[PDB]
Symmetry: C4
Subunit: 72 residues, 4 copies
Amino acid sequence: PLQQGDLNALVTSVQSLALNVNEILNTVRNLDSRMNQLETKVDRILSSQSLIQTIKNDIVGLKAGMATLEGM
Amino acid sequence: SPLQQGDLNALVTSVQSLALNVNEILNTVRNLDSRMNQLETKVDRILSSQSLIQTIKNDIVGLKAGMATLEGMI
Amino acid sequence: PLQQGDLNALVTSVQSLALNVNEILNTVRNLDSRMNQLETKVDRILSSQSLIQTIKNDIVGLKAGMATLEGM
Amino acid sequence: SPLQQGDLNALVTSVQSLALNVNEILNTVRNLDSRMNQLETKVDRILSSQSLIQTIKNDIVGLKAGMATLEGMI
């Protein structure tokens, strides 16, 4: 007849699995928070690409206006 | 003490409780997978503009040699 | 006397846990690969910051050389 | 068939095998946590340079008004 103690190894194995799963949970919740931060900052970088092409358009005018000066 | 059905049932509920934590992990890593894919797309867009900077650097060098030409002509 | 079938619910519960853990594993291996790609591309962006300050130095000269032209 | 110790032992080994997969997940998510921290630091460095672009845009606008001044003076 099986005894309660015959289940001990299985109980301990599940306890250990639960401890390690809990640490995964803690870590992935932190990854979720980190990803929020990364997304916000990448969106910030991407918005500044407006500057880039404004600089681009202005430089076109600077090149043209300067060919004028070279002519004069 | 003889092993009883209730002892096995206790482990079932423990495993099913653990399964809820596993389910949260799985939902969250799938969400992270989708969000990292979107992040890479935006990083791609930033990269494409970066060498437009290379052209800017070239245009500016050209403006430099020109302005020297103006001064040299006097 | 407990019978083999009395363990069925526990066996099934562990099978389901294993299936779902396997899908987490598949997903996190994919996150690892995605992170390699992100790291490589962010390093690429960061290196181009050299351009930025080169543009910065040159513009300083353009501002100065141009004050000269304004004087002339 | 009466439940036997070997039936319980089979579940122990199954759980311990599952634990190896859990261990790989845990090692990998910890590594991802470290790498996302480093990634954010590099994203910070990119952000700091981005508004140096804002100054560039300003200097270029100034060069624009100047070059018009040169042409206007003739």
